[PDB]
Amino acid sequence: RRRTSLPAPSPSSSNISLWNILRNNIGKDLSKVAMPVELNEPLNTLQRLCEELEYSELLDKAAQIPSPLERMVYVAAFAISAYASSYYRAGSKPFNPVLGETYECIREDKGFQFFSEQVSHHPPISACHAESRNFVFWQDVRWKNKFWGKSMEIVPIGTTHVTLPVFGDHFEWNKVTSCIHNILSGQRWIEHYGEIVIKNLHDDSCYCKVNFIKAKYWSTNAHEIEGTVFDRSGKAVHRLFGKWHESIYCGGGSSSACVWRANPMPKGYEQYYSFTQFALELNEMDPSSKSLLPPTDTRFRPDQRFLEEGNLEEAEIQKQRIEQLQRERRRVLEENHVEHQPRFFRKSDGSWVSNGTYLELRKDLGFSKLDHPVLW
Ligand SMILES: CCCCCCCC(=O)OC[C@H](COP(=O)(O)O[C@H]1[C@H](O)[C@@H](O)[C@H](OP(=O)(O)O)[C@@H](O)[C@H]1O)OC(=O)CCCCCCC
């Protein structure tokens, strides 16, 4: 049904430019350092946000569990699951979405409706919302990435929210710190360290803490997680252990059970940017839905598509042209002293949340009646 391959394979490696680019900007803000298209992968930060739903069935399961603590356990696993994918794409760069660029994924498969918009470019900020009968997932993310002499630090900012449709739950949790070791080189690998605190704003009963342990590459502790579900009193009720890229278990003492396991990677995934089966389907465009998409949707972005098709020269041409276009548009917008307003997200306190207009206007080819910004 869905594609399980790409028109052209990913290149051996073309990270020669990365050496000088990163050594010349130690300590500087990388979102301001333009980089060749050859370093990118066919997905952008909006689609990367969509991948956090690969294991969305965890929420489907928590949607019918009446105990709040078990619901907490499964949602914690879901929060950790958002990291599995990064293990194989150890060092990989997503496309930087254009201001106003949008991305959608209608999956009748997992019963969810996902959409997102790049609400800001200076600094880059991605916002997303996914709706389902069994949950509502939404978040706002921005970065503070920097390259120090031999390693890259990815610092995400913005919390993630999930709501369940029959219990009234509102889960809110923070992103953790990531490090890419040996980017310039050796064995390039990604590490995730820090503490995730998951709170249920609606249910006082419990809270959860998941620690992502940092260690030496060859250690039996690398990729480990130590989590606990605490009652209001502050007493440990359920332990969580395992490795964020293989399996997650609950229990710890008397008993134990595996609550989550990474999906097997496609046979020969190494030849396709080490994408997961899920990631392979995000940029595919299906003849019927093409008419329902808005022209700002990423599958339309020409440089990214040429990249999938293995056309490096024409991909680079399109990228620089899109950059010049974006600059001239922010130019015209600021010569009139008018701030930019995104189309599907309004700014509540500091976050970017859905303004309830995407799906509604998508109804019955409704996008065809209006007209959108031309980003390419
Ligand atoms: C990895 C986690 C994802 C975090 C990334 C999220 C933020 C992000 O896309 O910033 C991009 C940087 C490199 O910009 P790049 O792709 O050339 O995007 C261009 C630049 O932002 C450029 O300054 C801008 O010009 P303008 O300002 O004139 O408008 C253009 O509009 C953009 O096209 O890349 C990086 O952040 C470096 C990450 C390298 C990944 C690891 C490699 C192995």
Author numbering: 511 to 860, 862 to 887
Quoted passage from the original study:
The PI(4)P molecule was well ordered in the crystal structure with clear electron densities of the ligands. PI(4)P binds to the ORP3 ORD by inserting its two acyl chains into the hydrophobic tunnel. The phospho-inositol group of PI(4)P is recognized by the shallow basic pocket in the tunnel entrance. The conserved residues Lys829, Glu833, Arg836, and Arg837 from helix α8 make direct interaction with the phospho-inositol group. The 4-phosphate group makes hydrogen-bonds with the side-chains of the conserved His631 (β4-β5), His632 (β4- β5) and Arg837 (α8). The 1-phosphate group connecting the inositol ring and the glycerol moiety is hydrogen bonded to the conserved Lys603 (β2), Lys829 (α8) and the backbone amide atom of Met660 in the lid. The 5- and 6- hydroxyl groups of the inositol ring make direct hydrogen bonds with Gln836 (α8) and Glu833, respectively. The ORP3 ORD is unable to bind PI(4,5)P2 as the 5-phosphate group causes a steric clash with the side chains of the residues in the helix α8. The PI(4)P used in this structural study has the acyl chains of C8. Ligand modeling into the ORP3 ORD suggests that PI(4)P with various lengths of acyl chains up to C20 could be accommodated in the binding pocket.
ORP3 localizes to the ER-PM interfaces and is implicated in lipid transport and focal adhesion dynamics. The ORP3 ORD displays a helix grip β-barrel fold with a deep hydrophobic pocket which is conserved in the OSBP gene family. The ORP3 ORD has a central ligand-binding tunnel with a flexible lid covering the tunnel entrance.
